[PDB]
Specification:
Two copies of one chain form a homodimer.
Chain A (H helix, E strand, L loop, with lengths): L3 H28 L5 H30 L3 H24 L9 E5 L6 H17 L3 E5 L29 E3 L11 E3 L17 E2 H10 L3 H13 L4 H13 L6 E6 L14 H15 L8 E7 L4 H8 L3 E4 L2 H6 L8 H16 L2 E4 L4 H10 L10 E3 L13 E4 L18 E7 L4 E6 L5 E5 L3 E3 L3 E2 L8
Parallel strand pairs in A: 1-2, 1-4, 3-4, 5-16, 6-7, 6-9, 7-8, 9-10
Antiparallel strand pairs in A: 11-12, 11-15, 12-13, 13-14
The complex binds a molecule of 8 linked components (NAG-NAG-BMA-MAN-NAG-MAN-NAG-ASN) (2 copies) and guanosine-5'-diphosphate.
Chain lengths: 467, 453
């Protein structure tokens, strides 16, 4: 049986889109009869009117996802799936006889920062899960804390943290290492041979439930291992608890990560605070349609300690929540200390706890916070805006989309598409167009983002029925 | 549980709308820095890209309405509601004792065209249904046929078609006529007193189920009496079948009705919406031939349409050798059978066709485009809307609105703005159409529980 509110909202979304289309044709015809001041004046009003109209449509779509008991079901199903995966990971990590268990050894000391190192451990963990090997994490001489993983986080196992085994060797494939008890896994950047237990694929035994519950099952699958990893030590839980109080961290709140310093060189670009705040302002307007928002709170995480004073001045109607001492210690000089390790764990924690995350996905810091966020809600796939890259996991397999609508290129920078063409996406320009390659042609260029759908990849993982 | 396709479709509608907003902000910013011919070319290309993008969203929204067995449920529920009402109407129309039954007499000979006369009979029928009086239809001296109503349609009753009784009077109110057996009802144009059994209200006992199934319950309620009235005689049934074969009426097909003897609209004003909707249909089905059923009172229009749109196939009953009443009935039939209806709702004939169309699908309320008026029923009570989002007037022609304000709508300008009066402020002007919702009116009708036995 269909719900009454479900049908009212569906038809209102249809009529709102139709009316928006009536509005677009009428106003665009008027616009091309203008030039100079009048053209700029009316197009600005046109854009303002369109914004509210578009957000009313987005608000009805939000209500549609909650009506008819769908919100409670999606919450229950996401909770059941999380507990299913966590129990499997815990069973894998705690065999009865550690001296006889197949193992995978991971070294945390990758030459990069915390988020990059955390994603290395995640990649180790997912391959360990894929091969039914207990993850052994070797973290001594960790650049952030010489005492290792247990300085901040609980150990990845309770019964089996020892590397003992009758045979040991470097990774050389799941079939060749079939009878090697202890396999050491290197970093993903030069792994050969690559096993299938890599992003962005998900387990096929969970895929049907995931696509039904979650808008990007790839990130959800990655987040399950992030969730298991960052179980905090008791002293760290209390720091997080204390910081939440002293920071005045309450909802609604939008998280903003401004990555600079050594990233601006080659891995990303410099972005003014205005580029972040336009999306912060836009999302608070959306929230104000469904809830009361008296104070617009922004948790600002950044490695530029001069940004907080700048943001408070240029956006005085916002309440910025930030730890400027953490920002200062994030500088390349004082970056690899236990106090700085606490700082980045705290910054990522509050970013992940926000109701919306504005940042650059080229930074591993924001990707981690976006992954953790997936463990805090039934489906937080779209609660982000990245100023550059789409979501990715470094070392992932080819991220492919499928063309659903044909495209004939208007300029030379666009690529043709036929329905069914596999499209290897490179990025979303957030202007209606995405850049990628057509795997029937080899051509790279732009194409309308709405003319493709995400190709969900699946992999036959072990299901751990004993758990 | 939730449906996998339902969630996939909702999220794609969400992301499709989000990408549309990305596309709008980018191209409009570029559009401000243009002038002259380059502005015209980019604005025209902008509109073309927006069209296909908008239709992808609407297509996903159509699929959403169908998945998870929702299409089957809506068809079954719309069927149950129709059978329920038709069973009640049939019970009312066929009492056991005609000489003792309470009646309402309706004269079909209103001074207007066929479509307006049919609506007069509908308005009679709805009041008869409201007052539990058997409708007696008088069709002698009908300008369209000497033999009367039954030359085309079945009699409105099988057991009670005379006006016998103990007392007869003109309409004076349901309470005053409590003991008048046979009440004669005049046209609605000067009816006094007006009863509550009038559009656009729906029966309160059906309102909840109707809102769930149908996008415009008012026209659905009107269409039930249209459906009962136009039950065809066997020979009209065969003429319709013969006309269908000879014309090659097949689906998909869009109906176009062009009335021209009040205001003049050239054929291009109709065809732009015809072409737009065939582009929509082409996204969900194969469209080999773009067929258009053209109903017109203009002999030069059909040749104009064929000349200007040579890739279209135009169909009209002028192709039929054996065909005023027969012509308008066939026109109404084929227009109502179409997948989409482009016309002017100021025409009574198109309104009839739009109403019949509601009886052929679970929810066809939106399968139209009107060049002028929104749907109405002549003689209806005030059509009111409720403002849902505030509006600050941007020009002198716009009116303010606060959430909750009752808005008496005068029409939709099909440009994003509707025209009406804000009753809280006594001000009349323009307002964005998306900032209001329809105010569904209900009336306590009889429910005829004896019709279930
Ligand atoms: C040995 C070691 O220790 N290495 C350390 C690294 O591991 C650390 O991390 C790496 O940091 C890099 C830089 O941030 C990361 O690169 C980014 O990778 C993105 C992912 O690319 C994937 O997926 C894309 C789809 O999203 C796809 O298009 C790519 O082709 C790529 O996919 C391939 O696909 C193969 C199948 O086809 C598959 O087999 C491969 O496995 C897969 N590769 C990976 C890595 O998964 C990528 O999207 C980024 O690209 C953008 O940015 C650069 C500038 O940095 C631009 O040049 C690019 O054009 C691209 O621009 C983007 O383009 C979009 C389209 O227009 C646009 O919208 C975006 O805005 C724009 N982005 C901009 C402008 O910023 C980029 O290449 C890499 O993923 C990280 N790897 C891991 C494992 O985490 C690294 C951290 O700093 O540190 C290294 N350590 C050292 O160097 C140690 C040092 N030597 C020492 O001191 O000792
Ligand atoms: C005695 C006899 O037999 N008479 C015959 C008539 O009965 C036949 O039918 C009547 O035809 C009229 C002409 O087409 C119809 O009038 C139209 O009615 C429209 C509906 O008005 C409703 O609903 C509106 C909302 O949609 C609302 O705004 C209106 O105010 C009106 O509502 C009132 O509401 C009251 C409560 O407040 C309620 O008590 C009343 O009962 C109710 N009235 C009715 C009638 O229901 C109306 O929208 C039409 O108006 C548009 O068109 C006229 C031009 O005709 C314009 O001047 C208007 O401004 C308006 O324009 C529209 O404006 C919109 C806003 O900008 C815009 O979007 C539209 O595009 C635009 N449309 C245009 C320009 O076309 C119009 O008034 C009437 O409803 C019919 N009545 C019935 C019962 O069917 C008639 C036709 O066959 O024939 C008569 N017979 C003869 O003439 C023969 C003669 N006696 C002889 O020669 O012998
Ligand atoms: N506390 C804190 N630390 C940061 C911030 N931005 C960068 N850092 C530090 O700089 C390191 C950057 O390494 P990585 O995690 O790979 O992030 P990436 O360089 O942006 O890809 C982080 O691990 C942090 O130690 C920030 O906003 N807050």
């Amino acid at each position: 049986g269909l719900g009454k509110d479900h049908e009212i909202l569906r038809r209102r979304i249809e009529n709102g889109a139709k009316e928006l289309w009536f509005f677009l044709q009428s106003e665009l015809k008027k616009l091309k009869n203008l030039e100079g001041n009048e053209l700029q004046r009316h197009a600005d009003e046109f854009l303002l009117d369109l914004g509210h109209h578009e957000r009313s449509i987005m608000t009805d779509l939000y209500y549609l996802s909650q009506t008819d008991g769908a919100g409670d079901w999606r919450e229950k199903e996401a909770k059941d799936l999380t507990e299913l995966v966590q129990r499997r990971i815990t069973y894998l990590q705690n065999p009865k006889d550690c001296s006889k268990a197949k193992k995978l050894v991971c070294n945390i000391n990758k030459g990069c920062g915390y988020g990059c190192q955390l994603h290395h451990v995640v990649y180790c963990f997912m391959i360990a899960y894929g091969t039914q090997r207990t993850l052994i994490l070797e973290s001594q001489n960790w650049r952030y804390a010489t005492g290792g993983w247990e300085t901040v986080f609980r150990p990845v196992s309770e019964t089996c943290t020892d590397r003992s085994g009758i045979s040991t060797g470097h990774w050389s494939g799941e079939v060749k290492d079939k009878n090697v008890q202890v396999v050491e896994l290197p970093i993903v950047d030069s792994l050969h041979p690559r096993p299938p237990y890599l992003p962005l694929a998900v387990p096929e035994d969970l895929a049907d439930r995931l696509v039904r519950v979650h808008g990007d099952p790839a990130v959800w699958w990655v987040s399950q291992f992030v969730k298991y990893l960052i179980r905090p030590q008791p002293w760290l839980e209390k720091e997080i608890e204390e910081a939440t109080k002293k920071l005045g961290f309450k909802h609604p709140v939008i998280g903003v990560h401004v990555r600079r310093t050594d990233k601006v060189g080659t891995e990303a670009a410099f972005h003014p605070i205005e580029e972040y705040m336009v999306h912060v302002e836009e999302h608070f307007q959306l929230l104000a349609r469904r809830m009361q928002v008296d104070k617009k709170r922004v948790y600002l995480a950044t490695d530029d300690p001069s940004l907080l004073k700048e943001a408070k001045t240029k956006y005085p109607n916002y309440e910025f929540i930030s730890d400027n001492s953490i920002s200062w210690s994030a500088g390349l000089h004082n970056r690899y200390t236990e106090n700085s390790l606490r700082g980045v764990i705290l910054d990522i924690h509050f970013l992940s706890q926000a109701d919306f995350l504005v940042c650059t996905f080229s930074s591993q810091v924001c990707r981690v916070a976006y992954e953790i966020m997936q463990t805090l809600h039934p489906d937080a796939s779209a609660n982000f805006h990245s100023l550059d890259d789409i979501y990715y996991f470094g070392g992932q397999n080819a991220h492919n989309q499928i063309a659903i609508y044909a495209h004939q290129p208007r300029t030379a920078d666009e690529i043709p598409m036929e329905p069914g063409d596999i499209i290897g996406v490179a990025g979303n320009h957030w202007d209606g167009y995405s850049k990628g390659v057509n795997r029937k042609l080899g051509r790279t260029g732009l194409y309308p983002s709405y003319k493709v759908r995400e190709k969900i990849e699946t992999v036959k993982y072990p299901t751990y029925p004993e758990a």
